[PDB]
Amino acid sequence: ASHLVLYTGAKMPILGLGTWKSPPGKVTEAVKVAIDLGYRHIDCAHVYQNENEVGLGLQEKLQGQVVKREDLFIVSKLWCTDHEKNLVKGACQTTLRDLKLDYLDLYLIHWPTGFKPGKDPFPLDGDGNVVPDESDFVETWEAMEELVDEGLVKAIGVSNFNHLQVEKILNKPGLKYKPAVNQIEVHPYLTQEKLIEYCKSKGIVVTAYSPLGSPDRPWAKPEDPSLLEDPRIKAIAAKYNKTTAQVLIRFPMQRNLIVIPKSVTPERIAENFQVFDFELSPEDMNTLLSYNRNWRVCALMSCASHKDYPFHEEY
Numbered sequence: 301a302s303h304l305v306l307y308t309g310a311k312m313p314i315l316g317l318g319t320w321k322s323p324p325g326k327v328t329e330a331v332k333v334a335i336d337l338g339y340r341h342i343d344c345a346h347v348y349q350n351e352n353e354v355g356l357g358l359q360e361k362l363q364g365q366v367v368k369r370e371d372l373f374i375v376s377k378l379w380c381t382d383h384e385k386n387l388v389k390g391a392c393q394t395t396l397r398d399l400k401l402d403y404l405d406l407y408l409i410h411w412p413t414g415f416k417p418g419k420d421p422f423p424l425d426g427d428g429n430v431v432p433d434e435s436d437f438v439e440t441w442e443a444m445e446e447l448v449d450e451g452l453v454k455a456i457g458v459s460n461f462n463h464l465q466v467e468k469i470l471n472k473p474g475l476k477y478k479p480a481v482n483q484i485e486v487h488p489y490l491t492q493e494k495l496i497e498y499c500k501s502k503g504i505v506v507t508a509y510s511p512l513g514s515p516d517r518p519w520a521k522p523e524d525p526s527l528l529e530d531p532r533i534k535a536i537a538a539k540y541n542k543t544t545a546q547v548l549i550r551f552p553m554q555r556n557l558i559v560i561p562k563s564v565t566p567e568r569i570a571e572n573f574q575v576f577d578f579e580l581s582p583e584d585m586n587t588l589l590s591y592n593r594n595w596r597v598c599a600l601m602s603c604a605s606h607k608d609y610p611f612h613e614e615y
């Protein structure tokens with residue numbers, strides 16, 4: 301519809317602004333423009349290194365009475381070097397101060413993999429492998445639970461977790477709050493029909509990230525598949541009087557999933573918002589779902605050997 305409901309009752313905006321790779325000196329204005337066009341959901345993370353700049357845009361719009369804190373849905377995430385129980389609260393407070401907020405609407409464990417603690421976000425060894433830590437994400441979750449108890453966050457969830465890892469939390473003895481969301485990569489080349497189905501059956505909302513394939517990702521190579529430049533999608537896109545992107549955003553929304561496309565360009569930030577006026581054909585929906593080639597543009601290959609790497613499993 302226009303929003304989905306988490307198992308806690310909270311209404312979560314079906315659409316949101318993504319901020320990974322949004323330069324600090326451009327993200328403040330992108331947030332400002334979005335809050336002005338109608339966006340009420342902003343997706344952030346400590347590891348993006350721009351939460352401070354994101355916090356300024358929110359502060360200015362909240363101070364100008366343009367938007368009420370309670371109509372805003374702000375999400376952030378706990379980074380891998382902060383999985384150790386005693387390190388979780390600090391990381392949450394840091395993100396809170398940087399964004400200039402009293403609480404978060406949703407706080408997610410970024411990846412199931414914990415890295416050796418430190419200032420370096422990706423601590424590698426001589427072989428270019430990321431160094432892991434001595435923690436399990438089940439103990440990290442218990443600390444995420446305290447956050448709710450103290451009112452620092454309204455809800456907690458996971459990101460890039462496989463159905464077996466989620467199950468590990470769902471069956472944790474002494475479990476207080478279960479995950480409300482699972483943010484995962486979902487685009488035509490990776491429709492995730494199985495993980496979504498598993499999540500839904502458990503009452504967990506699914507947020508789809510990189511809905512456009514993330515053509516601006518660092519590792520993207522000249523010979524890399526392109527979702528925005530695919531004749532087929534452009535075809536269904538043309539017959540709708542919309543753009544490839546506008547349809548790529550409607551697709552995950554029609555499947556009952558939350559989407560968070562990213563753009564620091566005001567014109568696209570508005571076009572990304574022009575997707576609540578139309579609909580896709582039950583067949584058009586099927587044509588897209590069929591392009592699934594299990595191709596993830598985000599597989600953290602440097603973590604492939606981590607005991608908790610999530611992508612060795614089917615789903």
Ligand SMILES: NC(=O)c1ccc[n+]([C@@H]2O[C@H](COP(=O)([O-])OP(=O)(O)OC[C@H]3O[C@@H](n4cnc5c(N)ncnc54)[C@H](OP(=O)(O)O)[C@@H]3O)[C@@H](O)[C@H]2O)c1
Pocket residue numbers: 317318319320321343344410459460483484509510511512513514515516517528543545546560561562563564565568569571572598
């Ligand atoms: N939880 C996780 O591990 C995870 C992983 C990956 C991504 N994410 C999240 O999902 C968000 C989106 O994913 P992403 O940044 O990887 O990629 P994305 O939104 O799929 O793609 C971003 C690219 O699309 C362009 N674009 C946006 N709207 C467009 C439009 N209407 N027409 C043509 N081009 C357009 C952007 O350009 P400009 O910006 O230059 O306009 C940008 O280079 C992130 O910012 C982040 O919040 C989360």
Ligand SMILES: Cc1ccccc1CC(=O)Nc1cc(C)c(S(=O)(=O)NCC(=O)O)c(C)c1
Pocket residue numbers: 320345347348518519598600
């Ligand atoms: C290290 C580096 C330096 C200069 C240019 C590119 C890169 C590679 C790079 O950007 N790696 C990378 C960084 C982050 C920060 C993530 S991530 O895990 O943060 N992405 C998930 C998200 O957007 O939340 C990933 C997967 C790769």
